[PDB]
Enzyme design. Structure first.
Site, PDB file in Angstrom:
ATOM      1  N   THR A  86      21.675  44.047 -59.786  1.00 60.47           N
ATOM      2  CA  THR A  86      21.362  43.228 -58.640  1.00 60.47           C
ATOM      3  C   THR A  86      21.466  41.746 -58.969  1.00 60.47           C
ATOM      4  O   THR A  86      21.244  40.880 -58.094  1.00 60.47           O
ATOM      5  CB  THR A  86      20.108  43.608 -57.810  1.00 60.47           C
ATOM      6  OG1 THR A  86      18.960  43.174 -58.622  1.00 60.47           O
ATOM      7  CG2 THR A  86      20.144  45.024 -57.297  1.00 60.47           C
ATOM      8  N   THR A  87      21.798  41.495 -60.202  1.00 60.03           N
ATOM      9  CA  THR A  87      21.990  40.102 -60.703  1.00 60.03           C
ATOM     10  C   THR A  87      23.393  40.020 -61.378  1.00 60.03           C
ATOM     11  O   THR A  87      23.911  41.036 -61.829  1.00 60.03           O
ATOM     12  CB  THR A  87      20.871  39.501 -61.604  1.00 60.03           C
ATOM     13  OG1 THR A  87      20.851  40.156 -62.885  1.00 60.03           O
ATOM     14  CG2 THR A  87      19.474  39.405 -60.987  1.00 60.03           C
ATOM     15  N   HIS A  90      11.846  47.442 -61.663  1.00 58.65           N
ATOM     16  CA  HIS A  90      13.125  48.065 -62.131  1.00 58.65           C
ATOM     17  C   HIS A  90      13.030  48.413 -63.623  1.00 58.65           C
ATOM     18  O   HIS A  90      12.844  47.595 -64.518  1.00 58.65           O
ATOM     19  CB  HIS A  90      14.406  47.211 -61.880  1.00 58.65           C
ATOM     20  CG  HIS A  90      14.744  46.983 -60.491  1.00 58.65           C
ATOM     21  ND1 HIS A  90      15.433  45.931 -59.987  1.00 58.65           N
ATOM     22  CD2 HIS A  90      14.459  47.751 -59.366  1.00 58.65           C
ATOM     23  CE1 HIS A  90      15.552  45.954 -58.669  1.00 58.65           C
ATOM     24  NE2 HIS A  90      14.955  47.103 -58.275  1.00 58.65           N
ATOM     25  N   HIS A  98      11.556  44.977 -65.541  1.00 58.36           N
ATOM     26  CA  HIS A  98      11.319  43.650 -64.889  1.00 58.36           C
ATOM     27  C   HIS A  98      11.026  43.877 -63.423  1.00 58.36           C
ATOM     28  O   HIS A  98      11.155  44.980 -62.898  1.00 58.36           O
ATOM     29  CB  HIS A  98      12.507  42.703 -65.057  1.00 58.36           C
ATOM     30  CG  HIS A  98      13.767  43.236 -64.450  1.00 58.36           C
ATOM     31  ND1 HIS A  98      14.646  44.067 -65.026  1.00 58.36           N
ATOM     32  CD2 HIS A  98      14.224  43.110 -63.155  1.00 58.36           C
ATOM     33  CE1 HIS A  98      15.619  44.416 -64.209  1.00 58.36           C
ATOM     34  NE2 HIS A  98      15.371  43.808 -63.104  1.00 58.36           N
ATOM     35  N   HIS A 133      15.180  34.031 -64.738  1.00 56.43           N
ATOM     36  CA  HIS A 133      15.272  34.627 -63.402  1.00 56.43           C
ATOM     37  C   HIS A 133      14.211  35.728 -63.145  1.00 56.43           C
ATOM     38  O   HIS A 133      14.068  36.161 -62.033  1.00 56.43           O
ATOM     39  CB  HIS A 133      16.645  35.213 -63.071  1.00 56.43           C
ATOM     40  CG  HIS A 133      17.240  36.127 -64.087  1.00 56.43           C
ATOM     41  ND1 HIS A 133      18.165  35.629 -64.981  1.00 56.43           N
ATOM     42  CD2 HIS A 133      17.063  37.432 -64.350  1.00 56.43           C
ATOM     43  CE1 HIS A 133      18.535  36.659 -65.800  1.00 56.43           C
ATOM     44  NE2 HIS A 133      17.917  37.708 -65.401  1.00 56.43           N
ATOM     45  N   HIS A 138      11.029  41.797 -59.290  1.00 55.43           N
ATOM     46  CA  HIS A 138      11.508  40.960 -58.222  1.00 55.43           C
ATOM     47  C   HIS A 138      10.309  40.829 -57.262  1.00 55.43           C
ATOM     48  O   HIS A 138       9.766  41.870 -56.920  1.00 55.43           O
ATOM     49  CB  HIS A 138      12.704  41.463 -57.406  1.00 55.43           C
ATOM     50  CG  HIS A 138      13.872  41.714 -58.348  1.00 55.43           C
ATOM     51  ND1 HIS A 138      14.792  40.814 -58.690  1.00 55.43           N
ATOM     52  CD2 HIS A 138      14.195  42.857 -59.002  1.00 55.43           C
ATOM     53  CE1 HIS A 138      15.648  41.318 -59.502  1.00 55.43           C
ATOM     54  NE2 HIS A 138      15.348  42.563 -59.713  1.00 55.43           N
ATOM     55  N   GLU A 141      13.864  44.268 -53.214  1.00 54.26           N
ATOM     56  CA  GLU A 141      15.384  44.159 -53.121  1.00 54.26           C
ATOM     57  C   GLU A 141      15.825  45.194 -52.077  1.00 54.26           C
ATOM     58  O   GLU A 141      16.379  44.889 -51.040  1.00 54.26           O
ATOM     59  CB  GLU A 141      16.055  44.254 -54.419  1.00 54.26           C
ATOM     60  CG  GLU A 141      15.629  43.004 -55.367  1.00 54.26           C
ATOM     61  CD  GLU A 141      16.661  42.782 -56.408  1.00 54.26           C
ATOM     62  OE1 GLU A 141      17.121  43.587 -57.187  1.00 54.26           O
ATOM     63  OE2 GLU A 141      17.077  41.593 -56.359  1.00 54.26           O
TER      64      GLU A 141
HETATM   65  O1  LIG Z   1      18.485  46.013 -62.779  1.00 56.71           O
HETATM   66  S1  LIG Z   1      18.940  45.345 -61.511  1.00 56.71           S
HETATM   67  O2  LIG Z   1      18.153  44.019 -61.093  1.00 56.71           O
HETATM   68  O3  LIG Z   1      20.330  44.765 -61.887  1.00 56.71           O
HETATM   69 ZN   LIG Z   2      16.128  44.105 -61.076  1.00 59.10          ZN
END
Ligand SMILES: O=S([O-])[O-]
Ligand SMILES: [Zn+2]
Length: 256
Positions: free
Chosen positions: A195-196, A116, A91, A61, A93, A103
């Site tokens: 966020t996941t 992030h 990581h 992802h 997005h 995001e």
């Molecule tokens: O670190 S956040 O994408 O859950």
């Molecule tokens: Zn993230």
């Protein structure tokens, strides 16, 4: 399995993770006129001189840059935080197009990508224990705008070739997160979640005001990654961002 497609996209997560409709969901739209200047908030304290990067991984992802979190080597304190948070991984997005990817949104404005920097509260002893606590995690959020290249990011750009598909990993040592930070450390903070999936509401979000700029070509290499494993039909790793969630009476505070 969850993903970002029409069939397993963010609008479906709630079926497998009911928390998707929870009270402190992330991300959100950051309304600048509404956020409150809070003078009692301290300057962020970022100590990353000792950071120990280990490896880079394509987990289906996104791509995670992982760090040695067995000691207080790269940590974050101050800001709205109580105690020490150790850096575990970072990581991004990003989108299919430069006009989307982030995001978080600022006054409904979307950036090309969002970085992030994930940290966990050390009084809980391990990352796994920390995601179960209201204040287990601190996540540094940095926006990416397309412009000039980011010196500091090329090392990442270069290895993406070796981790093209899901489950591939590469050695990635001696990488310094400092080259990813903007000049200013001015921020907005609110209590949110991952966020996941499992979307756990264990995060203190720290979102930086000042975006970092990266070149078109830097951004283009992110878009060459695949969500799919090797020998599988190809599905470009693009738009791996969850849309803004209801603020639901949470208050966004500003350090400036
Ligand atoms: O670190 S956040 O994408 O859950
Ligand atoms: Zn993230």
């Amino acid at each position: 399995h969850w993903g970002y497609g029409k069939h397993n996209g963010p609008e479906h997560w709630h079926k497998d993770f009911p928390i998707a409709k929870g009270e402190r969901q992330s991300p959100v739209d950051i309304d600048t006129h509404t956020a409150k200047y809070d003078p009692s908030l301290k300057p962020l304290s970022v100590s990353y001189d000792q950071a120990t990067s280990l490896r880079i991984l394509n987990n289906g992802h996104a791509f995670n840059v992982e760090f040695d979190d067995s000691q207080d080597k790269a940590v974050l304190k101050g800001g709205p935080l109580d105690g020490t948070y150790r850096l575990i991984q970072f990581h991004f997005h990003w989108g299919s197009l430069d006009g989307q990817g982030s995001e978080h949104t600022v006054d409904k404005k979307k950036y090309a990508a969002e970085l992030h920097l994930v940290h966990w509260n050390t009084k809980y002893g391990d990352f796994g224990k920390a995601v179960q606590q209201p204040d287990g995690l601190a996540v540094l959020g940095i926006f990416l705008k397309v412009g000039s290249a980011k010196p500091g990011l090329q090392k990442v750009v270069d290895v993406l070739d070796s981790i093209k598909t899901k489950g591939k990993s590469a050695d990635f040592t001696n990488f310094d997160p400092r080259g990813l930070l903007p000049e200013s450390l001015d921020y907005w903070t609110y209590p949110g979640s991952l966020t996941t999936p499992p979307l756990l509401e264990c995060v203190t979000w720290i979102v930086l005001k000042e975006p970092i700029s990266v070149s078109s070509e830097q951004v283009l290499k992110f878009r060459k990654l695949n969500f799919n494993g090797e020998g599988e039909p190809e599905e470009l790793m693009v738009d791996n961002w969850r849309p803004a969630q209801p603020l639901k009476n949470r208050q966004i505070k500003a350090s400036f």
